[PDB]
Amino acid sequence: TLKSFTVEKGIYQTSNFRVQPTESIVRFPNITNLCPFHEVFNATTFASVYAWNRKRISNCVADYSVIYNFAPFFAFKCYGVSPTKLNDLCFTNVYADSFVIRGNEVSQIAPGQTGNIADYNYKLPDDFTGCVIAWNSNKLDSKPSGNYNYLYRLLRKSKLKPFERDISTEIYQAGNKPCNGVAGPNCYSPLQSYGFRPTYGVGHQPYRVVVLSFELLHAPATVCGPKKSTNLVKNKCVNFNFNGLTGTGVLTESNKKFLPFQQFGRDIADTTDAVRDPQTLEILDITPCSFGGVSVITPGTNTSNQVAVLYQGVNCTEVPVNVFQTRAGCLIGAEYVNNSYECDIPIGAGICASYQTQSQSIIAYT
């Protein structure tokens, strides 16, 4: 610690002792259903962009490794989560949105974009924590005469709010002459056909887009991935993995009066101290196990190599990862004498230490 081979007389703070965990426990809810990803990804005909379908996915085991087999896309583009780590963590609810766009307006489905799809048909919020997938569909979504089945809205009075739908098909009025069901000057139909054709360029093929919206974990945890649970342990410094919230601590029985909506417990430093077990409705306190400062009390290396160790601020009936109890921790390797000399190496509350003769050994005295 001192980056030197010889040390001088005094007390040095070197490092810290900490009890390493010996067990790892994982607590997941007892659910058995399989999430319906096949009925979302493998469909005969998706709806258009102005009328995207919303499907709620909950109360099932979500396996995200079978997504690649259902549809031949390239990459699993996500923003708030990495595409790598879906399975170990778990969420509250999963929403599915699907629509078919052109190849130019793919980057508009992203948080904070401006265009035609983003302004009047489908807008993503400021803080999106889901995934967006897109792949080419030139073989199942094109005719030589033209695919007139899908529409997009070209004009609207105002931009949409995030996660909004506009199904109404009234004639848009841009002038002062009233429309009254007549499409003329400044009375334009909002929906325009895409007009897909197999002989287009690379930027103009139809693209099927599926949105995997995720919300972060809250009081319910209905949809969660595949992970084997572990029996609960208490009063031991262990690793806990409660619904994807990893950490290390000691679980004890609690007397906190949680309300039925409350699930977690946060302190002034914004870290979890109280958790609710999803299997058995009980509250467990989370505290770290035994740790503290370690100080080395030594004379010089020119004199001796005998070292006393001061474990700072612990009631040392719990030493491991002569013994005198001090008000400033406790000493190991220094005996206490019933005398009083001048203070050579200071330790704490009136207690010092020195290296003396009367077999040489390290003593501690007031």
């Binding site: 703070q13 810290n16 900490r18 708030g80 989560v81 990495s82 595409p83 790598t84 780590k85 170990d88 963590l89 994807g244 919230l245 990893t246 950490g247 290390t248 004890t252 609690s254 007397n255 302190d267 002034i268 430093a269 914004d270 870290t271 979890t272 101290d273 306190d285 505290t287 770290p288 035994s290 740790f291 503290g292 400062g293 700072q312 601020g313 612990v314 009631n315 008000r327 400033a328 921790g329 203070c343 200071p346 704490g348 509350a349 009136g350």
Partner: protein
């Protein structure tokens, strides 16, 4: 505002004004000498038992070493300040069992044998008046482990890696030093501060102390009961002043309050995101892959390191101010108690 009352003193070239009596007044001067000693673990504060956070924190170099060195220097300097202020005698003098000092009674400043601590009455009011923060100068891991009531602030400070060291000299040793100094200046006069303590009667020492200011010594000997009664009333009014008003010790109260508030702000700095996606490191570990979580961890590490450096700089400036006040208190201790000073308003 009003600068003061208006006085037009009557001046003439053949007029003199001379006092015909005197009053004896006892005042009170309060000076801070030291503050709380704090030791900060940077690795537990920044990372919190995360391995790759430690691996990415080793890339930043030796910031932790120099911040720990600065805080260790402050902790050494506080004990040095207390040692140079209070410890000024080679021998612990003791008062005689008789309590007659020419009519002056020092029963409200000399220690009493009933209490386990050797603290006098006025020192008992001074220690009861200042509300300490009750920090980790006593060991508190047994109380922090045992879940009683709610979560304390000091338990959160201990769990986040912030530790308060106890001072080297206990309150009993400070009270013993104060009692030895009081007994020396009561019995031996100013002669104990310049070598061997030479005994003297207290009325004759009082005659010398009137002789040093320009008043002849026959004034005291003809009026000794009046000086005794005035001194008794003056030292009795300090009791009634300190038993009611709690605004006298505001300097020591602010010394406690600043070191509590700095630690509270340093703990509260952990809840900010610093431009990342989450303020909790384990959510960043579990939610992201290697490179992106390395970017977020680097952002959090820079923010927490900036907070810790700000705390260390503020503690260094406050330590310089406290050291200046402790040097002033040591000079006032040497020149007012151990002798007699002719400096005006000192």
């Amino acid at each position: 505002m009003s600068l003061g009352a208006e006085n037009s003193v009557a001046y003439s070239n053949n007029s003199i004004a001379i006092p015909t009596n005197f009053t004896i007044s006892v005042t009170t001067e309060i000076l801070p000498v030291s503050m709380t000693k704090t030791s900060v673990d940077c690795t537990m504060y920044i990372c919190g038992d995360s391995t790759e956070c430690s691996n990415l924190l080793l890339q930043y170099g030796s910031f932790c070493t120099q911040l720990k060195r600065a805080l260790t220097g402050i902790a050494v300097e506080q004990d040095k300040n207390t040692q140079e202020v209070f410890a000024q005698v080679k021998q612990i003098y003791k008062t005689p069992p008789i309590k007659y000092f020419g009519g002056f009674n020092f029963s409200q400043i000399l220690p009493d044998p009933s209490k386990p601590s050797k603290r006098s009455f006025i020192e008992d009011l001074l220690f009861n008046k200042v509300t300490l923060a009750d920090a980790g100068f006593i060991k508190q891991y047994g109380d922090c482990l045992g879940d009683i009531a709610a979560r304390d602030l000091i338990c959160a400070q201990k769990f986040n890696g912030l530790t308060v060291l106890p001072p080297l000299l206990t309150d009993e040793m400070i009270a013993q030093y104060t009692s030895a100094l009081l007994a020396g200046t009561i019995t031996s006069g100013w002669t104990f501060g310049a070598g061997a303590a030479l005994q003297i009667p207290f009325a004759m020492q009082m005659a010398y102390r009137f002789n040093g200011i320009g008043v002849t010594q026959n004034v005291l000997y003809e009026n000794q009961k009046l000086i005794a009664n005035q001194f008794n009333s003056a030292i009795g009014k300090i009791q009634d002043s300190l038993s009611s008003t709690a605004s006298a010790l505001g300097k020591l109260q602010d010394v406690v309050n600043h070191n509590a508030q700095a630690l509270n702000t340093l703990v509260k700095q952990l809840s900010s995101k610093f431009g990342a996606i989450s303020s909790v490191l384990n959510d960043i570990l579990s939610r992201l892959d290697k490179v992106e979580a390395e970017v977020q961890i680097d952002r959090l590490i820079t923010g927490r390191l900036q907070s810790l450096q700000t705390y260390v700089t503020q503690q260094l400036i406050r330590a310089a101010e406290i050291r200046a006040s402790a040097n002033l208190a040591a000079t006032k201790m040497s020149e007012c108690v151990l002798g007699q000073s002719k400096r005006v308003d000192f």
